[PDB]
RNA sequence: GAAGAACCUUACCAGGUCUUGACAUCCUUUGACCACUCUAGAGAUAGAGCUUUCCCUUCGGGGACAAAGUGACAGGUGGUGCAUGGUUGUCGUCAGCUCGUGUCGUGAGAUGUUGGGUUAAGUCCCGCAACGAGCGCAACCCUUAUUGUUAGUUGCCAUCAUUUAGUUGGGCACUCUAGCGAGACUGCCGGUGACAAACCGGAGGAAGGUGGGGAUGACGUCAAAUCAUCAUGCCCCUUAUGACCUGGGCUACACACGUGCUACAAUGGGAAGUACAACGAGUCGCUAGACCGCGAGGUCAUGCAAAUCUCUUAAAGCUUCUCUCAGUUCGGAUUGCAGGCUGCAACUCGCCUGCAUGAAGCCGGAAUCGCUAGUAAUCGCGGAUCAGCACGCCGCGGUGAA
């Protein structure tokens, strides 16, 4: 119970918001639609996998967009899943929502797959080590510079948890010109939660 | 409070003002903490409810400055 | 007409000189030495660098600063006679600075960290 | 001279970039432009505990920077009048039109 | 017993000294920004998530 | 402290006595930085010994540095843990302070009912060699080789 | 934690109750739903009436839910931080903790990481059987101490006039604000020191040897604490533990202890005048001017989306008499009265003024702790949760020891 979230030191000097916004006479409002958003694309999230998700505001329209994985899971074939989710947001937004998908150019940029892929396999019975092994050596084999993991639960179908997950390369924790990445999922098969703390690092 | 309008319950007020010039009763159950008395309330014998367990008192002409709920407390205290 | 300016910052408190030749007053909020300010109006205090130039002087001053007390913004008066002898004698500047006369106080009000009471005062531990 | 117009956000870079774009579309047409003043950007202040049952001296707190412009136009043109009423990019920054 | 209280506020009050607030996706009575319409403890978590705007780490 | 040593910061004379160690007499009785009570009530006792047995209050100031003046001071210093010490030469630094930490905690002591004549019979106390300030540097004499007893395995 | 207990908020008792229930899925009547008042009631409620009115149609149905009754139930601040995730304390800002090639030992293992002087520091130099590579540390990040240029309003007073005011003639002159820069980085010099780090002294400089301060806490150490933020497997119920109302209470006092405030006094008071900022808050929220009050305040009515205007011209000093040494012009404890304001209402259970008794306290015993400088010690301003409710909190400024 001693370490700093590393997200919340780099926001705010190198990195940026999902918030193009002046928030002025409303802001609750869209504060807990922007939670509406988040809880309503939760369930579209299985197959799909966006990563980043950005909000813009038009005069009288709502221009957000998504940065998925897979190009065709929500485009669809002529625009037909496309247009039947603006309909679905459109009742929880209430204004003129107006989209765009975009590709993620060499894909495996994402931190939010590799923790969903390894909560997949956590949850598909794969014992602890050679699991987060294979995940740091396919990172590499895409080339990453260091990828640290502390994962705790109750691990391996057995008792009380651990600290552990190890690592390749240098990594820059403590610096500031970084650019370093993090996430937390919630993971369990049948006891209790198996959560993931992992790490990346790609250098500047 | 009382001298920018009495603060008097109204309908416990119309369970009152049907026995104005009526016979003093008994009983009234009721709730009787939140209206103080002004001096038109003379000679009656209100049920007040603590809050548990109601214990009536009766009705003098002095009583002009306070409530129905000064006189059974809420302590049990022994 | 002739007039000086010389600015001057302690504690929170610009103070512009308008510094013109008489016999050595002040019009402070254009009010004189004692119409401001009380008996800590010292000698070494105020007229300190007349006695290294324009000795003993002096010439009267006109002044309009704000901030600190009655000690607090006297010390930007240093600061107003150090940039009017910057303006007029380049010679005694360094007499002027071998007795210092020109290094700013770089002391604001302390950062008072939560967690404790003050800037440093730290709570009464109370062990047992 | 009967054209002002104020420009609020959160940081300084896209303000005054977005200021020195409409200064340069309102003085193309005409002349004469004012400053584009910077104001003296008003900063909050919050003070939110660390943990949740216990331990409140473990402070972590957050403030909010709010820069502000405004900008003046003299000897005013119908066409910079045009322009102003027909272009508020860019849209992610929010600005208070008078004239 | 948690539940009665969330559907409890969305009600009109029965008068006027009854209108407390609390926050939306939790239930925290004490601590909630009504600037905010959020509670202590989301606030900071949610800015460490990236999704507030405007908020920032104070140090002068 | 633990390091090495440390600075002293020497205090500057008064534009008004031009006298450097009054500023020290001053700096010792003011409480909260209030110069306008407590100050210009030392400058009231002194001006009261001008008027009676006296002249010029920087020669009475000399007068009480020396009738005050610790010749000798002690300072614990143990090694195996029982009561060490030995008369120690003293700097006239601390030998100021010693002195005149007696006038002003004796000025502390003696409280008389006003709030300048306890200043004023202090101060003519300990300029004519009366008062126990000057009975605490007659005392200061006396323990000056009282601990000798053990101050002579040094 | 509880950043505001008069009900609610609220867990806990007394009374009045209900059971696909307020909540979650759907059918069904297919209704437009709610809108509108009366009787009694502590209400939860028991009992009535008005219009309420298809809100798309290739006239089919589904787009509206009060509603009706139902199923699988929903649900639970009931345990489980010693099954959990997460989050936060802790040494502690502590500098420690590792790896590859070469080499030693039969082997577990060792050498880098040891010996001298250097720094706040595993930072650096010289000797090193070790040659090289890391996380930490420093460091870039913010604030702020100095200045140049650029920008002048709602701010500033250079050239002068009017002034109750800097009104508008006047421009950004000084100032100020914020934009890019320059800036303090052993940057240069003398000596010590092997010529090595480093040290002692200078010059310039506003800032000299990382300027002051913040953000940033490695591996781990401690079954530390959090199921009362939320998720959460396991054991329990679901005509009740789930849900709705009225009064209470978490504010009671036979005692002990931690914390904050006030004097215990001739460094304290009263009459008089006179001063000096910064951070902010602000359109059902802050009040210009005037009136009337011992007063809490009320009244007519103006401004204010902010560099304009409201809190908002801060206090201890400065100069006179004073109580002139007392339970006292030290001090104000509890009590009767005039009230004032918030609220649906201030006995339980808000705050404040004034009038009237003038309590205790007459400098604190072991044992303690804060702190090495615009800091201790001390005096004022604003803000939060908030209709009202600070000796607490979080900042800001004023005087300023050893
Ligand atoms: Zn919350």
Same mark, same amino acid.
């Given at each position: 119970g001693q370490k700093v979230h590393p997200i919340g030191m780099r926001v705010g000097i190198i990195r940026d918001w999902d918030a193009k916004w002046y928030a002025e006479k409303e802001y609750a409002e869209f504060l807990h639609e922007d939670l509406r958003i988040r809880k309503f694309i939760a369930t579209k999230l299985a197959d799909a996998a966006v990563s980043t998700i950005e909000i813009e505001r038009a005069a009288n329209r709502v221009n957000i967009s998504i940065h998925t994985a897979k190009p065709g899971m929500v485009i669809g074939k002529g625009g037909s899943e496309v247009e039947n989710l603006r309909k679905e947001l459109n009742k929880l937004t209430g204004k003129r929502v107006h989209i765009n998908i975009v590709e993620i150019k060499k894909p495996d940029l994402d931190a939010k797959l590799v923790g969903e892929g390894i909560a997949r396999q956590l949850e598909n019975r794969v014992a602890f080590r050679?699991?987060?092994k294979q995940a740091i050596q396919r990172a590499m084999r895409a080339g990453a510079k260091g990828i640290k993991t502390q994962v705790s639960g109750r691990l391996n179908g057995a008792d009380i948890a651990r600290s552990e997950g190890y690592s390749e390369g240098t990594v820059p924790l403590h610096t500031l010109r970084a650019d370093i990445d993090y996430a937390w999922e919630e993971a369990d098969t049948t006891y209790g939660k198996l959560g993931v703390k992992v790490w990346i690092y790609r250098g500047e | 409070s009382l001298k920018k309008g009495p603060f008097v319950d109204d309908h416990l007020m119309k369970k009152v003002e049907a026995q104005q010039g009526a016979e003093?009763?008994?009983?009234?159950?009721?709730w009787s903490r939140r209206s103080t008395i002004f001096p038109s309330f003379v000679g009656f014998t209100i049920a007040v409810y603590d809050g548990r367990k109601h214990v009536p008192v009766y009705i003098q002409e002095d009583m002009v400055g306070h409530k129905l709920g000064e006189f059974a407390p809420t302590r049990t205290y022994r | 007409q002739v007039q000086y300016s010389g600015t001057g910052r302690r504690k929170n408190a610009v103070a512009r000189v308008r510094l013109v030749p008489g016999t050595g007053k002040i019009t402070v909020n254009k009010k004189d030495?004692?119409?401001? $300010?009380?008996?800590?109006?010292?000698?070494?205090? $105020?007229?300190?660098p007349f006695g290294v130039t324009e000795t003993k002087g002096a010439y009267d001053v006109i002044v309009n600063v704000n901030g600190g007390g009655y000690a607090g913004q006297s010390g930007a008066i240093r600061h107003g006679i150090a940039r009017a002898l910057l303006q007029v004698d380049p010679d005694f500047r360094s007499a002027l600075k071998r007795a210092g006369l020109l290094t700013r106080d770089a002391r604001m009000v302390e950062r008072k960290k939560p967690g404790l009471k003050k800037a440093r005062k730290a709570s009464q531990f109370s062990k047992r | 001279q009967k054209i002002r117009i104020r420009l609020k956000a959160y940081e300084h870079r896209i303000l005054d970039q977005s200021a020195d774009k409409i200064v340069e579309t309102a003085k193309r047409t005409g002349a004469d432009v004012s400053g584009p003043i910077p104001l003296p950007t008003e900063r909050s202040l919050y003070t939110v505990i660390r943990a949740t049952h216990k331990y409140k001296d473990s402070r972590e707190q957050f403030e909010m920077r709010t820069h502000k412009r405004l900008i003046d136009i003299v000897?005013?043109?119908?066409?910079t009048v045009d322009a102003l009423m027909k272009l508020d990019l860019p849209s992610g920054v929010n600005i208070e039109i008078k004239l | 017993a948690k539940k009665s209280m969330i559907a409890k506020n969305k009600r009109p009050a029965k008068h006027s000294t009854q209108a407390y607030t609390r926050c939306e996706r939790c239930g925290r009575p004490h601590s909630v920004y009504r600037k905010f319409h959020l509670?202590?403890?989301?606030?900071?978590?949610?800015?460490?998530?990236?999704?507030?705007?405007?908020?920032?780490?104070?140090?002068? | 402290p633990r390091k090495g040593p440390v600075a002293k910061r020497d205090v500057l004379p008064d534009p008004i006595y031009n006298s450097k160690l009054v500023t020290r007499l001053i700096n010792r009785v003011m409480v909260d930085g209030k110069r306008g009570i407590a100050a210009n009530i030392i400058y009231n006792s002194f001006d009261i010994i001008k008027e009676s047995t006296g002249n010029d209050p920087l020669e009475v100031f000399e007068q009480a540095m020396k009738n005050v003046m610790p010749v000798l001071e002690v300072k614990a210093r143990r090694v195996g843990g029982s009561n060490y010490q030995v008369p120690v030469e003293v700097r006239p630094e601390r030998r100021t302070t010693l002195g005149l930490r007696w006038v002003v905690n004796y000025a502390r002591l003696r409280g008389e009912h006003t709030m300048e004549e306890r200043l004023a019979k202090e101060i003519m106390d300990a300029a004519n060699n009366t008062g126990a300030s000057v009975k605490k540097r007659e005392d200061t004499?006396?323990?000056?080789?009282?601990?000798?007893?053990?101050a002579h395995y040094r």
């Open positions: 050679r699991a987060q | 003093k009763k008994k009983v009234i159950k009721t | 030495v004692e119409e401001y $300010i009380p008996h800590a109006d010292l000698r070494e205090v $105020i007229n300190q | 000897n005013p043109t119908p066409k | 509670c202590r403890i989301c606030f900071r978590e949610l800015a460490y998530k990236g999704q507030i705007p405007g908020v920032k780490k104070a140090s002068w | 004499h006396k323990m000056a080789d009282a601990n000798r007893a053990f």
